[PDB]
Design a protein around this ligand. Structure first.
Ligand SMILES: *[C@@H]1O[C@H](CO)[C@@H](O[C@@H]2O[C@H](CO)[C@@H](O[C@H]3O[C@H](CO)[C@@H](O[C@@H]4O[C@H](CO)[C@@H](O[C@@H]5O[C@H](CO)[C@@H](O[C@H]6O[C@H](CO)[C@@H](O)[C@H](O)[C@@H]6O)[C@H](O)[C@@H]5O)[C@H](O)[C@@H]4O)[C@H](O)[C@@H]3O)[C@H](O)[C@H]2NC(C)=O)[C@H](O)[C@H]1NC(C)=O
Ligand SMILES: *[C@@H]1O[C@H](CO)[C@@H](O[C@H]2O[C@H](CO)[C@@H](O[C@H]3O[C@H](CO[C@@H]4O[C@H](CO)[C@@H](O)[C@H](O)[C@@H]4O)[C@@H](O[C@@H]4O[C@H](CO)[C@@H](O)[C@H](O)[C@@H]4O)[C@H](O)[C@@H]3O)[C@H](O)[C@H]2NC(C)=O)[C@H](O)[C@H]1NC(C)=O
Ligand SMILES: *[C@@H]1O[C@H](CO)[C@@H](O[C@@H]2O[C@H](CO)[C@@H](O)[C@H](O)[C@H]2NC(C)=O)[C@H](O)[C@H]1NC(C)=O
Ligand SMILES: [Fe+3]
Ligand SMILES: [Zn+2]
Ligand SMILES: [Zn+2]
Ligand SMILES: [Zn+2]
Length: 341
């Protein structure tokens, strides 16, 4: 009847998927690939059914005909009466973060500094801040704005990979998967925290989830929120408490996508799966938790309360919203219809 194949990106996701697999009695199973881009291709081929993606990849996948099915939903303050699965999604704040101790650094003095990005093509780590930088500079030359960076998915021998560290052994430098030490929200933030870089483009939640004891990770257990500052677009710096007033943009939530002809089936199984291994699930911290991976954000972001139904039966353009879609288009003109494969 119903069996779903999930696409895991890199070996750590693979491992988490295998566990979910064994726990679901094989109701879910796993395919693995090296990059999100490849995973998308497996789905198009029909060798994989689904994966959860950042909005920048939702855009890629969309041109290829894939569709959003369920969105990530994190703890809400407003919109409280509704059960999470039917609660509207809020979106996340894309911020630029720096060290307080690095005085005098503002949005207007980023040129020639060192940067930490979650990965090329992602929303908070790339699309927003690079689009803004392309716009106010007039130049499509974004590889030349920062002196060095860690930008996973960029050419390993270019300046945009210069700060990436690879794995344990120094292998896989700048691969866009968790093998790369400075990959994703948590890796970019760690890139700033270790003073490898001057600024990190991550979301508001990351700063909080890795400071003041929220993470027992050794590179973080000792970090304090007051030690960081957010760069606002008007040239000022604020405490990380002012995010709602000092952000680069509001990002659409990460969401699960699948081929359109598989959407109904994918939706059904996952709804059941969260009942079982979700935030309050039947089995959930006893045997297995779909939304926990030790601050690593494997398959899903760790702050996910549930996957929510969409309503309005959104196309991918509707889901990301016209504002966001026009920034990608304009940025994409730098390096308008097709499917990237
Ligand atoms: C940037 O990202 C970071 C990291 O993710 C965000 O920080 C997180 O934000 C969330 C929610 O926004 C935090 O909420 C969590 O914390 C609580 C405990 O840890 C949890 O329980 C809360 O209990 C309450 C129950 O509804 C909620 O608020 C309460 O509601 C009343 C008013 O809001 C009020 O009760 C009475 O007293 C008032 C007196 O002033 C009266 O006026 C009222 O009328 C009423 O009688 C209480 O004051 C009370 O606060 C609350 O929302 C929670 O439900 C909760 O489960 C949740 O998990 C989360 O902890 C936090 N993480 C960290 C590390 O801080 C940050 O918000 C982001 N910021 C932006 C701007 O985007
Ligand atoms: C980098 O720089 C590029 C190039 O300028 C910039 O490009 C874009 O800039 C803006 C940002 O979206 C965009 O403006 C559009 O404005 C109107 C209005 O869109 C509506 O907004 C209101 C309120 O939300 C509402 O009417 C609708 O709900 C829409 O959301 C848009 O369409 C108009 O629609 C109304 C009716 O709805 C109509 O009366 C008008 O005649 C008009 O059709 C415009 O067409 C614009 O699309 C720019 O258009 C867009 N510019 C280009 C060249 O594409 C990027 O955003 C910048 N990149 C980054 C990351 O910042
Ligand atoms: C594997 O998937 C099936 C399909 O939902 C689950 O078994 C179903 O259980 C529900 C609730 O009792 C029934 O309504 C269905 O008719 C059952 N289907 C069949 C054919 O067995 C089962 O719970 C799933 N297992 C796990 C661990 O996820
Ligand atoms: Fe994202
Ligand atoms: Zn089936
Ligand atoms: Zn805003
Ligand atoms: Zn519609």
């Amino acid at each position: 009847y119903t069996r779903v194949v999930w696409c895991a990106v890199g070996p750590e996701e693979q491992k988490k998927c295998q566990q979910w697999s064994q726990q679901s009695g094989q109701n879910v199973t796993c395919a693995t690939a090296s990059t999100t881009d490849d995973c998308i291709v497996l789905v198009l081929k029909g060798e994989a059914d689904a994966l959860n993606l950042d909005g920048g990849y939702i855009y890629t996948a969309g041109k290829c005909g894939l569709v959003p099915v369920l969105a990530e939903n994190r703890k809400s303050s407003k919109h409280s009466s509704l059960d999470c699965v039917l609660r509207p999604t809020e979106g996340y704040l894309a911020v630029a973060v720096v060290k307080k101790a690095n005085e005098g650094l503002t949005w207007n003095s980023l040129k020639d500094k060192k940067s930490c990005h979650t990965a090329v093509d992602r929303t908070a780590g790339w699309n927003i801040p690079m689009g803004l930088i392309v716009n106010q500079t007039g130049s499509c030359a974004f590889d030349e704005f920062f002196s060095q960076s860690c930008a996973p998915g960029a050419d390993p021998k270019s300046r945009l990979c210069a700060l990436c560290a690879g794995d344990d052994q120094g292998l896989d430098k700048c691969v866009p998967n968790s093998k790369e030490k400075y990959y994703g929200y948590t890796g970019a933030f760690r890139c700033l925290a270790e003073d490898v870089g001057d600024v990190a483009f991550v979301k508001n939640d990351t700063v909080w989830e890795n400071t003041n004891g929220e993470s027992t990770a050794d590179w973080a257990k000792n970090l304090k929120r007051e030690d960081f500052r957010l760069l606002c677009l008007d040239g000022t710096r604020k405490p990380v408490t002012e995010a709602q007033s000092c952000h680069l943009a509001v990002a659409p939530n990460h969401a699960v996508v699948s081929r359109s002809d598989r959407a109904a089936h994918v939706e059904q199984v996952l709804l059941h799966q969260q009942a079982l291994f979700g935030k309050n699930g039947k089995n959930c911290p006893d045997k297995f938790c779909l939304f926990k991976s030790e601050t690593k954000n494997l398959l899903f972001n760790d702050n996910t309360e549930c996957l929510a139904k969409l309503g309005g039966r959104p196309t991918y353009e509707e889901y990301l919203g016209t504002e966001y879609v026009t920034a990608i288009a304009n940025l994409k003109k730098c390096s308008l219809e097709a499917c990237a494969f």
